[PDB]
Design a protein around this nucleic acid. Structure first.
Lengths: 62, 204, 51, 74, 121
RNA sequence: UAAGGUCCGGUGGAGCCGCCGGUAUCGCGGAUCCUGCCGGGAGUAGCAGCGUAGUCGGGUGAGAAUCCCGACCGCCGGAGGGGCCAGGGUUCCACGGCAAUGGUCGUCAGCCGUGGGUUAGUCGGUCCUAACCCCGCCCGUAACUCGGCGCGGGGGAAAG
RNA sequence: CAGUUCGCUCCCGUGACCCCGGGCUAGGGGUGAAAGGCCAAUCGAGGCCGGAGAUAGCUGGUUCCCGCCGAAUCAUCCCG
RNA sequence: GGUUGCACCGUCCGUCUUGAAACACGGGGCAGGGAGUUCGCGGCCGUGGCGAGGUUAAGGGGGUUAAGCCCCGUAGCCGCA
RNA sequence: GGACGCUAAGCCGCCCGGUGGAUGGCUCGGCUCGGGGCGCCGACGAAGGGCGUGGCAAGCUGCGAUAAGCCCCGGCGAGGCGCAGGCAGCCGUCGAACCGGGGAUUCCCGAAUGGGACCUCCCGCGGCUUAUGCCGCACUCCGAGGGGGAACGCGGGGAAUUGAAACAUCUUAGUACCCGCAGGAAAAGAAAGCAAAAGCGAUGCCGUGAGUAGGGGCGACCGAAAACGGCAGAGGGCAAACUGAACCCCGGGCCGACGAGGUUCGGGGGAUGUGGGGUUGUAGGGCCCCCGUAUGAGACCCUCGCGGGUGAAGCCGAAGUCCGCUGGAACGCGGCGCCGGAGAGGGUGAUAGCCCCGUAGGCGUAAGCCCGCAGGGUCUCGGGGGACCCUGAGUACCGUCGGUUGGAUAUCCGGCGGGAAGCUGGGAGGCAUCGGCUCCCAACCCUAAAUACGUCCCGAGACCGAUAGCGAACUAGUACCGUGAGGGAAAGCUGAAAAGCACCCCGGGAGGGGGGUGAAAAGAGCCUGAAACCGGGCGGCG
């Protein structure tokens, strides 16, 4: 679409995800059951990647 | 460093240069030769020159030349080393000199011979260095005095290292650095009968 | 309501409440020159705030 | 001892530095292409070699025997 | 010649970080000339419990008792080595033990007595 | 010739050179270059436009056109007002202040500082099931935090 | 005033209507009363990071002095 | 040296261009940052050693606090058709 | 007419004060390299994360409602109470702080596991006790496992921009990226090998062989190995043939130094075969016969006393702080003097061998390691006689199609189809087949040592130094932004000691000014204090 979108919707209001407790990010999806910052509610592993994208952020965060 | 931040384009349309800065804060850059925290044109490598071969013949001739400079009074004085014994250079002393490793007893033989005057120079710090190089270390040094060459009593002698500028060696492990430090020739040597006899023989 | 604050979230909010205080005097004497007040002071119109 | 930069100095305001124009020095097209850049090629991408003879070719033949059956006498 | 730290920056880092027991050693001061010979002990770690003389710095020839030994600021306070404050107080004057020489040894710790007689000599 | 160097006077209050042989993240006038600091524009425009509000006494105070009290006059009037859903999170209340903040102003304030205020068998959440979702087991896939079937179980409404 | 505003005017206002909350459909795929429109200020094929310092025959720019010699802008070939 | 009058001359700077004082492009001003580096291989050159020969690599012994230099190792390469 | 008689505003230069933060010196930080260490941990409830906790606490750091901590041992031992140099207050010298090992408690969340869940909450058993206190339990194996871990290692899956001046084989590349998985190295590894036909006998890695053979629009490009010199070394055990229970495991007791070794008692495996035998190569496979005869000289292990070194990161360690002078302070100048198995580098009010940490030298032990020294236990072996023994299958090998590699007729592996032989036999030596010659036994398994890493500790610099080097030297991956994935800064310096300004005048004034402040032009992001720029003034012009 077309620039000028920010007066139309009172959005963000009520989320579409919530505060995790495996990482505390605001991505534990209440309409599924999946964490998209580290995996939880569908998973017993943390995400395992050699990108690094996550692994690096996490180490610095830790 | 200098690929630490992604580098994304500010573009044209607003009348400034099209030269990339960053995403979130336009205030720094990367993958440019400017910026805090960045690369230049090409950083310094670990791969830089650090070995230089020299041929066995070529190295040996250098040793011969540097020891020849020592036996000429004029070169020794030019380097700054001042000697009482004008007609005699280098000095050979009796074989007993090695065994002595009282710092004070081995000092006295030097004083008499007139070769303490070089050691006074090294008492004065002349390896003093200006600039901020003090921060990295390796200043306030002593000047290289005479060279004491022994046959044995190990490679270092325990009554000939304490003295200023007196650096100890053996004739099996002799080197161009000891003969003419800095590529300035004209540094005194002092022999022991067993070293002099063993150097007569050529090793390579 | 506002909906709604579980038991742990009142604790978090409470941590957040503490931070919005200026640094007390006794610290600055103890350091012996000085510690500026330093941004963790909270507004309520101007504060939107990821979790 | 001497460096490449030393030899260039900072120069005359040539702004190229011994390769003439600053528009024929900006990449790999400038070279005429990277690497050898064709030889037996039907296009004359690289036409003429580096010697006057134009281009000199490869893909001629004559066997080498197995290394074990050969002997080159000494 | 000697095992060294030739970077001054690491040498300083060593100096700051030291264990508490080692910090006492930096706070040692030469025994006066009569004593130094008599025990054969070069120096010993200055404490509260001793008398000391300041011979260098602004008071010279002054002697006084050690009030405090501070290991973070690496200075010691002696009574009558003092400053006068311009708000009408008399406040202590810190000086390092390196300017100072320890005029008398007063022993009231049993380890310390074992050392002076025996090991330290 | 020069690139450049040296000396003097003031400031400064601890480090600094020359000579020779080495070395390179080694010398800037420009890149619609990057960054910091600063001037002109200007003390201009903007602080008028939409249904357009103050004004006179008196109180307080270092200071009052816009803080408060009294009087008078408006604007809004099923809706620039009242109660709530979402959201905010202390903005609530109280007391003390004016350097900062309020398109001017300020003794006022949601600003700054410090204390204090939300007390539930009988309200609602929780619970029920809905659209629909997820987990285990079987199986697949080389394999999976992937995939759905067939079984078994749980979850699922702050306007039902 | 506003990264889409203001006034007036206009169309619809029981309907194939509008509207809330939950859930569902995801990238050569969806969704589309069909504009190549839309899918989080990005759609003739979204954003993110890695490959990656992609490549250019193409624009801009490339830093201290002095001394000596001092041009060619023609010729052949080439998807040139 | 600061500033200024007179006589005379004098259309920036850099880039682009066949031609720029330009109605071609770029610059508000000052400071700081700011662009020829490394490796391999080939072709050149200068110097130096040795000579129909030349050169050793890897390694361990050795020496040293470590290490370099010093000695051994000629595997292997090149030239002598 | 000329004259300075008044030329404002303003232009140019300089000067003085401010602004500003450049510049130099300064650096408890980076960066790179060398050596060694660390070399796994977790449902026996990890790591990670959250929220509290201190006298005052805003962040950091440390801990868990026993909350900047508690206990024990050994070591060092006379002042402490983290970053933070305030006051109050607290404890120790009758042994703290600190260091090493070990222990207690170690909330909630998280593999998280009974269930759900914005980091909270509720429950069904069984032990338990006064009891709800309190302890164990309800995901998946067998009668032990998830998950984590800095990279490295193993096995699979597997791009494209780019190059070829375009473009499709080829190239990029077996790279990026994805999944499973092990260790402190991994894996390979004790011969159906090599093939200079001669010589060798497990296997890694480094140098070399070599940009050589070979591949390839025969274009660009790609690319070995045998061998050599080194390094380090170590070999064996199953199935079967033939014997046929001669055997093995588990829990409890006893004996013995808990041990080495042996016994008994309740169960299980095993006659669909434990054990004996035998194991690359036919060993003669069997059964025999002479003798020493598998006890075993050794070789290995275990127990325990001694001795030696190592190991609680800790001890001990020489010699000027003398005189005169300058200065705020000597580390300066002159003079005298001192030590060395010991003139490194920091520090101290400045430029210190002898003022101090230290240093050359030597030394220490508990848990723990190594060796021999007192005892006990286990244990390999050796000859010639007939019929030579299925002695390892969808294998060998071939057929069809690919993937891949230098692999070329001659790489390696997979899928689909066919399909042997019995050491009397088979395989290999770079085309097929047949012959000679030589080497060598696939279809069973493990394996120490030499070789990879960079979490960490130390040492080092022709390395960098606060608009540089890590994004970050200073509460940083912090502040901050974004639905999220993800993105991401800036902020270093008083002085010897704070003496960090009493007391006084003025000012509404907490600001500022006057005076007193060793230096204050060191008076509060305060060492130094550039330029652009602003004000006034001076000199010239107008």
């Amino acid at each position: 679409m077309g620039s000028g979108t920010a007066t139309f919707g009172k959005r963000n209001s009520t989320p579409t995800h919530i505060r995790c407790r495996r990482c505390g990010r605001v991505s534990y999806n209440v309409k599924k059951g999946y964490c998209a910052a580290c995996g939880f509610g569908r998973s017993r592993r943390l995400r395992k990647y050699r990108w690094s994208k996550k692994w690096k952020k996490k180490k610095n965060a830790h | 460093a200098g690929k630490r931040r992604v580098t994304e384009n500010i573009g044209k349309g607003h009348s400034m240069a099209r030269v990339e800065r960053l995403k979130t804060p336009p205030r720094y850059a990367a993958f440019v030769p400017f910026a805090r925290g960045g690369r230049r044109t090409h950083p310094p490598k670990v791969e830089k020159i650090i070995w230089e071969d020299i041929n066995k013949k070529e190295k040996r001739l250098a040793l011969m030349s540097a020891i020849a400079a020592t036996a000429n009074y004029d070169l020794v004085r030019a380097r700054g080393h001042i000697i009482d014994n004008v007609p005699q250079l280098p000095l050979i002393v009796v074989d007993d000199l090695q065994k002595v490793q009282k710092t004070r007893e081995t000092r006295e033989i030097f004083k008499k011979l007139g070769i303490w005057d070089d050691i006074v120079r090294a008492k004065e710090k002349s390896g003093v260095r200006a600039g901020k190089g003090k921060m990295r270390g390796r200043r306030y040094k002593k000047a290289k005095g005479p060279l004491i060459v022994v046959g044995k009593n190990e490679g270092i002698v325990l009554g000939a290292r304490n003295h200023p500028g007196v650096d100890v060696v053996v004739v099996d492990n002799l080197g161009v650095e000891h003969l003419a430090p800095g590529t300035h020739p004209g540094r005194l040597t002092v022999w022991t009968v067993s070293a002099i006899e063993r150097l007569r023989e050529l090793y390579g | 309501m506002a909906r709604n604050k579980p038991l742990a979230k009142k604790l978090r909010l409470a941590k957040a409440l503490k931070q919005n205080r200026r640094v007390p005097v006794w610290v600055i004497v103890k350091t012996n020159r000085r510690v500026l007040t330093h941004p963790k002071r909270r507004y309520w119109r101007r504060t939107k705030l990821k979790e | 001892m001497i460096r490449r930069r030393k030899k260039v100095r900072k120069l005359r305001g040539s702004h190229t530095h011994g390769w003439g124009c600053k528009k024929k020095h900006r990449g790999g097209g400038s070279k005429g292409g990277r690497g050898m850049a064709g030889t037996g090629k039907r296009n004359k991408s690289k036409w003429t070699w580096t010697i006057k003879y134009a281009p000199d070719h490869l893909g001629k033949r004559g066997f080498s025997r197995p290394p074990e059956v050969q002997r080159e006498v000494r | 010649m000697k095992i060294s730290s030739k970077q001054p920056r690491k040498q300083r880092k060593f100096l700051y970080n030291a264990p508490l027991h080692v910090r006492q050693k930096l706070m040692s001061a030469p025994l006066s000339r009569e004593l130094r010979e008599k025990y054969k002990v070069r120096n010993l770690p200055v404490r509260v419990g001793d008398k000391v003389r300041i011979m260098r710095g602004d008071y010279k020839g002054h002697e006084g008792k050690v009030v405090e030994v501070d290991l973070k600021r690496y200075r010691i306070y002696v009574e009558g080595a003092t400053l006068r404050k311009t708000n009408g107080t008399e406040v202590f004057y810190p000086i390092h033990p390196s300017n100072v020489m320890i005029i008398e040894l007063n022993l009231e710790d049993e380890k310390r007595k074992k050392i002076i007689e025996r090991r330290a000599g």
